[PDB]
């Protein structure tokens, strides 16, 4: 969370398994695998997603709580994401990259 230190709120990050459908409301996202991330308390939220291998999982975020802000701090905030290996990642059959022509 790259907002002001005075700002606070809650965001609900929901992960849906590959078979399952994407949640349509915050209530259906709450009735599943989720984490209610208090932004005023902690500024980083880490989650390791399993079964990523080769219809995959969907990760979503919902306003559980609006960003509560004092008169001095700006309302609009930004969030950055960081994807990395969760310490396994076995890779077996090397091929050619589809990026360079």
């Amino acid at each position: 969370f790259c907002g002001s230190a005075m700002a606070t709120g809650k965001l609900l990050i929901s992960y849906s398994p590959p078979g399952a459908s994407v949640p349509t409301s915050r209530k259906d996202a709450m009735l599943g695998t989720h984490i209610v991330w208090d932004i005023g308390l902690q500024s980083s939220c880490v989650l390791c997603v399993p079964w990523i291998s080769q219809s995959a999982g969907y990760i979503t975020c919902w306003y559980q709580t609006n960003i509560v802000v004092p008169p001095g701090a700006p309302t609009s905030c930004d969030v950055l994401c960081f994807a990395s290996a969760c310490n396994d990642f076995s890779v077996r059959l090397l091929r050619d990259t589809p990026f360079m022509a």
Binding site: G9, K10, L12, R26, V36, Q64, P70, P71
Partner: protein, 237 residues
């Protein structure tokens, strides 16, 4: 700033927990089946907009958990049941906001109809996930008399601090945790037709702020049914 997980859910969480009547929820011809897996997971309700003019809110449990996943699903399948209901309330307010809440549980909170002669038609008490707001003045009709200064029950709202309660003072803390160890005379009751307790949140000191702050403060309620058990569907030996 320890965050506790429980089931497939996790919430981030002044670790002062109020245990209702000093007793922790426990278990117990008759054969009860208890589902330890699931049910206990936190069920976060929709946040409520607390404003300068907000008089209060109330929820009736277990019926407020009517649609909350497996716990609400079990209520349909099983005739009888009992649970423990850890309740977390997190105000999430800035330093430049002032206010004071009473988060209280009030077991067997029988309420009175507005028009005294007639009774309300069973839906003025409770809608499942959405709360019912109080009112600032008296009301009329076939709805619950939802005027604060009486909390719908006829008692004074000031001396309503005798139940399991917590004070949320935005100056000091923004969190509350109450544990309600299934207060009832019969050991099991039908969840649909019986309301065990009524979580009601009442602002004693109203919300106040200056013009730049957000016009509201969203209050988040989180319920985890602890030690839930039901009746045995399968035949005895």
């Amino acid at each position: 700033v320890r965050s506790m997980t429980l089931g497939n859910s996790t919430i981030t969480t002044s670790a002062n927990v109020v245990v209702g009547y000093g007793e922790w929820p426990s278990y117990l011809e008759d054969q009860p089946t208890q589902p330890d897996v699931a049910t206990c997971r936190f069920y976060t309700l929709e946040s409520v907009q607390w404003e300068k003019t907000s008089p209060g809110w109330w929820w009736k449990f277990p019926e407020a958990l009517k649609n909350m996943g497996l716990f609400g699903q079990n209520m349909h399948y099983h005739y009888l049941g009992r649970a423990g209901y850890t309740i977390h309330v997190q105000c999430n307010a800035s330093k430049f906001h002032q206010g004071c809440l009473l988060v209280v549980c009030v077991p067997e909170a029988e309420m009175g109809c507005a028009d005294t002669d007639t009774t309300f038609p069973a839906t003025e008490l409770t809608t499942e996930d959405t709360p019912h707001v109080f009112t600032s003045d008296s009301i009329t009709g076939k709805k619950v008399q939802a005027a604060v200064c009486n909390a719908g029950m006829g008692v004074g709202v000031g001396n309503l601090t005798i139940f399991p309660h917590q004070w949320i003072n935005l100056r000091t803390n923004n969190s509350a945790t109450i544990v309600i160890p299934y207060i009832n005379s019969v050991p099991m009751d039908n969840m649909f037709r019986h309301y065990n307790f009524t979580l009601m949140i009442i602002p004693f000191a109203p919300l106040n702020f200056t013009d730049g702050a957000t016009a509201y403060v969203p209050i988040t309620v989180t319920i985890a049914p602890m030690y839930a058990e039901y009746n045995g569907l399968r035949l005895a030996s």
